[PDB]
Amino acid sequence: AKTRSSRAGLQFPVGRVHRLLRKGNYAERVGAGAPVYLAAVLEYLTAEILE
DNA sequence: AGATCACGCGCGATATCAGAATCCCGGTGCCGAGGCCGCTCAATTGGTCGTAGACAGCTCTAGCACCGCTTAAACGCACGTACGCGCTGTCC
């Protein structure tokens, strides 16, 4: 699978989250797992609200 | 004078006579949502290099702990007064 969400088994965009973390002036560098973790958390909260 | 029965008055509950507002059921037209299509930009793949972070060794500062005194502060008790709370009436 190409998309990083598919690798992480998520419906939210890991690539977009990584890009925002980088172009958000949050830190000099952004780990590889931070976008995955944040996408998973956002997906969980979205599902929790939508249920 | 006391007890029982009948009648009258007062209070509570149900019904009701109504009528008022809400919810519901149906038909209807709509526009807002879901979906398909095409295009392209942003994400992915591959590779590099460099520094940020991980790890080990050492240092010594600060946290923990312990003891013992002394004494400020908490705890306890009691009297009472004044504040909380309930009841009531009036006016707006």
C-alpha of A36 from chain center: 4
CB of A5 nearer than 7 A to strand B: yes
SS3 labels along chain A: CCCHHHHHCCCCCHHHHHHHHHCCCCCCCCCCHHHHHHHHHHHHHHHHHHC
Residue type, A21: L
What is the experimental resolution, given in Å to one decimal place?
Answer: 2.8
CB of A6 nearer than 7 A to strand B: no
Experimental method: cryo-EM
CA of A14 to C1' of B18 (A): 67
CB of A33 nearer than 7 A to strand B: no
Distance CA A26, CA A20 (A): 9
CA of A51 to C1' of B20 (A): 39
